[PDB]
């Protein structure tokens, strides 16, 4: 075939119920999460070719930068609470691998403030039990799925792209064909 599994996306050996329909998880310590975000703009490329009626979720994983890590997932609790996802992402994404800027939670709150976000607005989210349960969602979508490393996305919890198995020498191709991976999964 022309998408074979163990090449462009594997399979599950154990397929997750109820799961989002496509499901991406990334860390802002993740070098190729970086990549994924500001050079090659996945995410969006992959949105711009599924078919409607699809939502794509996006989560953060603790497993990077141990006790940063953790903010950065309850950040991204806030961020996503807020709907504010698309004004935090780069400079947290910078302020972390760029910059370095970030070191504390302090810092990541600055990040927000800067973005417009109020602090009184933004501790009140942080210390919420909407922003708890959101923590425990994100923990949870990465438990069901072995999540050990990133970036990864997963589509109607049974496939798992498979990045390593397409061609690098041409970002755009890259990009594409990742896409209508995406894509040709959704419609399986």
Same mark, same amino acid.
């Given at each position: 075939?022309?998408?074979?599994?163990? +090449?462009?996306?594997?399979?599950?050996?154990?397929?997750?119920?109820?799961?989002?329909?496509?499901?991406?998880?990334?860390?802002?310590?993740?070098?190729?999460c970086?990549?994924?975000?500001?050079?090659?703009?996945?995410?969006?490329?992959? +949105?711009k +070719?599924?078919?409607?009626?699809?939502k794509?979720?996006?989560?953060?994983?603790?497993?990077?930068?141990?006790?940063?890590?953790?903010?950065?997932?309850?950040?991204?609790?806030?961020?996503?609470?807020?709907?504010?996802?698309?004004?935090?992402?780069?400079?947290?994404?910078?302020?972390v691998?760029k @910059?370095?800027?970030?070191?504390?939670?302090?810092?990541?709150?600055?990040?927000?403030?800067?973005?417009?976000? +109020?602090?009184?607005?933004?501790?009140?989210?942080?210390?919420?039990?909407?922003?708890?349960?959101?923590?425990?969602?994100?923990?949870?979508? *990465?438990?069901?799925?072995?999540?050990?490393? $990133?970036? *990864?996305?997963? $589509?109607?919890?049974?496939?798992?792209?498979?990045?390593?198995?397409?061609? @690098?020498?041409?970002?755009?191709?890259?990009?594409?064909?990742?896409?209508?991976?995406?894509?040709?999964?959704?419609?399986?």
């Amino acid at each position: 075939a022309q998408y074979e599994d163990g +090449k462009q996306y594997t399979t599950l050996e154990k397929p997750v119920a109820g799961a989002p329909q496509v499901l991406e998880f990334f860390s802002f310590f993740c070098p190729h999460c970086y990549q994924f975000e500001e050079v090659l703009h996945i995410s969006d490329n992959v +949105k711009k +070719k599924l078919p409607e009626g699809v939502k794509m979720t996006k989560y953060h994983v603790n497993f990077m930068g141990g006790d940063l890590g953790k903010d950065l997932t309850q950040a991204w609790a806030v961020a996503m609470a807020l709907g504010v996802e698309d004004k935090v992402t780069v400079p947290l994404f910078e302020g972390v691998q760029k @910059t370095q800027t970030i070191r504390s939670a302090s810092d990541i709150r600055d990040v927000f403030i800067n973005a417009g976000i +109020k602090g009184e607005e933004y501790d009140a989210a942080w210390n919420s039990f909407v922003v708890k349960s959101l923590v425990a969602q994100q923990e949870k979508a *990465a438990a069901d799925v072995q999540l050990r490393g $990133v970036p *990864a996305m997963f $589509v109607n919890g049974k496939y798992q792209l498979n990045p390593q198995g397409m061609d @690098t020498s041409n970002m755009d191709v890259f990009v594409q064909q990742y896409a209508d991976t995406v894509k040709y999964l959704s419609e399986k």
